[PDB]
Amino acid sequence: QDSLSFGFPTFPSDQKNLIFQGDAQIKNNAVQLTKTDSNGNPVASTVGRILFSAQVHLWEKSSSRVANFQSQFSFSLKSPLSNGADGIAFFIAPPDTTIPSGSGGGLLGLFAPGTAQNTSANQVIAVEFDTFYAQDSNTWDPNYPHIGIDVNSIRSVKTVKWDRRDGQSLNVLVTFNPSTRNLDVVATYSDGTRYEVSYEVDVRSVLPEWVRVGFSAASGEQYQTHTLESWSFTSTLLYT
Amino acid sequence: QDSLSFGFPTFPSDQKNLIFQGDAQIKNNAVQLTKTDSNGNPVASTVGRILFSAQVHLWEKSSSRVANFQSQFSFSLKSPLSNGADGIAFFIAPPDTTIPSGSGGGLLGLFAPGTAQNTSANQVIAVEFDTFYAQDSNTWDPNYPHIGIDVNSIRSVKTVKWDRRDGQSLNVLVTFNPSTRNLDVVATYSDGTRYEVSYEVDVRSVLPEWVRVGFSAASGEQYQTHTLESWSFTSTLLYT
Numbered sequence: 203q204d205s206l207s208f209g210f211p212t213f214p215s216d217q218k219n220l221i222f223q224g225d226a227q228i229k230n231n232a233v234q235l236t237k238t239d240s241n242g243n244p245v246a247s248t249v250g251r252i253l254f255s256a257q258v259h260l261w262e263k264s265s266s267r268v269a270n271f272q273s274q275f276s277f278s279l280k281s282p283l284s285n286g287a288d289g290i291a292f293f294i295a296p297p298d299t300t301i302p303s304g305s306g307g308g309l310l311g312l313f314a315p316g317t318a319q320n321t322s323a324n325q326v327i328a329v330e331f332d333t334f335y336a337q338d339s340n341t342w343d344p345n346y347p348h349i350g351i352d353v354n355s356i357r358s359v360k361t362v363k364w365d366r367r368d369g370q371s372l373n374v375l376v377t378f379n380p381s382t383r384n385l386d387v388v389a390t391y392s393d394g395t396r397y398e399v400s401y402e403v404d405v406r407s408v409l410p411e412w413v414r415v416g417f418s419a420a421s422g423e424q425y426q427t428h429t430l431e432s433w434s435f436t437s438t439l440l441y442t
Numbered sequence: 443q444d445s446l447s448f449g450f451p452t453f454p455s456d457q458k459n460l461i462f463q464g465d466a467q468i469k470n471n472a473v474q475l476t477k478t479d480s481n482g483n484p485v486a487s488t489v490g491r492i493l494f495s496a497q498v499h500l501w502e503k504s505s506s507r508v509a510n511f512q513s514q515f516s517f518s519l520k521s522p523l524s525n526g527a528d529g530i531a532f533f534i535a536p537p538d539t540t541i542p543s544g545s546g547g548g549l550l551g552l553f554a555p556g557t558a559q560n561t562s563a564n565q566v567i568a569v570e571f572d573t574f575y576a577q578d579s580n581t582w583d584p585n586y587p588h589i590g591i592d593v594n595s596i597r598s599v600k601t602v603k604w605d606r607r608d609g610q611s612l613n614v615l616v617t618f619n620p621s622t623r624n625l626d627v628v629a630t631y632s633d634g635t636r637y638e639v640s641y642e643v644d645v646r647s648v649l650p651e652w653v654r655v656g657f658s659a660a661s662g663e664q665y666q667t668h669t670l671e672s673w674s675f676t677s678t679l680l681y682t
């Protein structure tokens with residue numbers, strides 16, 4: 203299809219169009235990307251991702267068209283500690299993507315240790331909400347919590363300082379305009395606190411014509427829940 | 443997802459989200475549901491169907507909601523014979539639906555001979571454009587080409603007279619309003635000739651909560667191409 207849109211205001215237990223990977227599962231009408239124990243507390247060493255099952259036609263070589271797309275979602279992070287880890291990311295990747303070996307912790311379930319910073323070895327565009335940045339293990343991160351745009355590497359091409367608020371939902375709008383090639387991110391807390399980051403990227407040189415979209419989250423030694431509460435997506439192929 | 447929409451203004455060869463069954467295949471940017479030889483001419487004894495891969499959430503028991511959906515599509519039929527057969531149908535069925543054994547010809551690839559008129563034996567809602575009505579073989583049909591609404595049986599719950607026009611595209615809009623439970627069908631030719639038929643049906647009593655949508659066509663001893671040219675579909679769950 204030239205156009206595709208879907209909306210999940212909540213996530214009831216009987217899902218048919220979601221591919222669950224790792225520890226991801228539905229609980230209490232939300233997707234819990236990382237593992238929790240019996241009483242709902244986050245645990246260490248867990249990775250989980252979900253992808254929508256239908257493939258998205260991102261660009262078409264024969265017609266020279268590229269899709270405009272918009273992804274809106276909300277999530278909350280909760281943790282007994284004050285330095286919860288590691289973060290959640292919205293990502294776009296080839297359809298057959300699976301959790302890479304050793305991609306836990308700061309690699310967010312998106313990159314393999316050996317090639318995490320090698321741009322020629324990956325095919326992924328992700329918008330990360332990164333809460334852990336200790337320089338001994340997350341050497342690629344700025345030294346503060348941040349939202350970052352990742353293009354084939356865990357070392358973001360662009361970041362903005364961000365504030366983690368335990369238990370508060372963050373509403374996010376991610377938009378890609380093929381006319382300007384701008385991937386824009388706007389995130390807001392309910393009190394109006396806003397964060398914005400953008401980057402120019404030609405999606406045609408990074409990803410294949412057909413892709414899958416989804417979310418990934420991980421916790422290494424430090425942990426927190428990564429609860430995806432709602433998600434809507436729309437894509438339309440346009441001539442530019 | 444509570445809402446899902448997709449649009450195929452045309453059908454390029456590179457498809458990823460269509461399930462092809464039987465002889466259906468893409469040719470010349472359209473879906474040819476029934477088999478054609480090398481020269482693009484129709485042949486006898488063929489059946490084909492396509493289904494969109496993502497499942498549609500038609501109704502939800504736990505929330506007392508039912509979907510409002512609209513399906514817009516265009517198709518054309520062509521045959522050198524004076525009695526081209528058998529017809530094309532838009533249908534909604536359980537996700538695991540497959541072509542029933544012996545469902546060729548007048549059964550349109552939707553029903554098995556033994557239970558074709560047994561309503562308690564099927565789960566399908568279909569809108570048929572039926573061009574073959576010989577009273578000796580298609581005993582359930584009215585004696586003229588017609589548009590029919592089929593609910594668990596090849597003997598339509600209702601039909602309206604229709605004119606088959608060789609090689610001319612018919613544009614069709616099928617809508618279902620959960621508030622009134624009306625399934626409405628409006629079809630038009632390019633000169634403005636219009637056909638309309640409506641039926642009240644509680645989809646919750648006929649189909650499961652999650653379904654797949656698609657098209658089916660067949661040719662028995664007489665034949666014609668059944669070419670699906672474009673298709674858009676949208677569905678959203680609403681409180682009733």
Ligand SMILES: OC[C@H]1O[C@H](OC[C@H]2O[C@H](OC[C@H]3O[C@H](O)[C@@H](O)[C@@H](O)[C@@H]3O)[C@@H](O)[C@@H](O[C@H]3O[C@H](CO)[C@@H](O)[C@H](O)[C@@H]3O)[C@@H]2O)[C@@H](O)[C@@H](O)[C@@H]1O
Pocket residue numbers: 525527528546547548549574576577578579580661662663664665
């Ligand atoms: O795709 C159309 C139709 O094909 C299959 O039905 C076959 C055949 O059934 C009826 O006649 C049976 C036999 O008739 C003769 O003995 C031979 O031609 C033999 O080969 C046939 O099998 C009949 O309905 C027939 O339709 C033709 O004849 C009728 C009546 O003379 C006429 O009104 C029609 O326009 C046509 O010429 C039909 O081909 C099955 O697969 C059906 O489900 C399917 O609808």
Ligand SMILES: OC[C@H]1O[C@H](O[C@@H]2[C@H](O)[C@@H](O)O[C@H](CO)[C@H]2O)[C@@H](O)[C@@H](O)[C@@H]1O
Pocket residue numbers: 287288306307308309334336338339340421422423424425
């Ligand atoms: O989840 C945080 C972090 O855990 C793991 O690394 C550890 C941390 O850097 C911190 O606890 O110090 C430890 C000792 O040096 C170190 O092992 C990894 O999974 C890492 O990727 C993750 O960010």
Ligand SMILES: [Ca+2]
Pocket residue numbers: 288289308332333334335340343
């Ligand atoms: Ca980090």
Ligand SMILES: [Ca+2]
Pocket residue numbers: 528529548572573574575580583
């Ligand atoms: Ca018939």
Ligand SMILES: [Mn+2]
Pocket residue numbers: 330332342343344348350356358
């Ligand atoms: Mn980071």
Ligand SMILES: [Mn+2]
Pocket residue numbers: 570572583584590596598
């Ligand atoms: Mn009929």
